[PDB]
Structure 1
Amino acid sequence: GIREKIKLVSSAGTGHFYTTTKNKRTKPEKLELKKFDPVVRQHVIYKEAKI
């Protein structure tokens, strides 16, 4: 039980977020993925934030 929960927040400023987990020791760099934002209905960049 080392992987901590994180939220990936939309860059579209919709407030929509996905959640996932992350090994913060091994991979300290912030996760950044293009994901579908259903509010704007577009693939936008999602960036890591605190759960």
Structure 2
Amino acid sequence: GIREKIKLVSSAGTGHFYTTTKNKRTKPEKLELKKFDPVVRQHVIYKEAK
């Protein structure tokens, strides 16, 4: 509805992304969560893009 989809692209250099939904009215800035990257097998930072 109002909460639409974004993807958290990996900042470990590879092509990997988790998918989540974010309320774009209240939060206008990106998401920054440390999430597991299985290609490199370590916890890197995961910025959002689309």
Where on the TM-score scale, by shorter chain, does this alignment land: which range? over 0.9
TM-score (ref. length: structure 2): 0.95
RMSD over aligned CA atoms reads 0.5
Percent identity between matched residues is 100
Instruction: Report the Cα offset of residue 4 of structure 1.
Output: 1.2
Instruction: Report the Cα offset of residue 13 of structure 1.
Output: 1.1
Distance 1:47 1:4 in 2: 17
1:42 aligns with 2:42: yes
Describe the superposition over 1:8-32 as per-residue Cα deviations: whole angstroms up to 9, x where unpaired.
0110111010000000010111001
Distance 1:16 1:25 in 2: 26
TM-score (ref. length: structure 1): 0.93
In the alignment of these two chains, the number of paired residues is 50
Unaligned 5+ segments in structure 2 are none
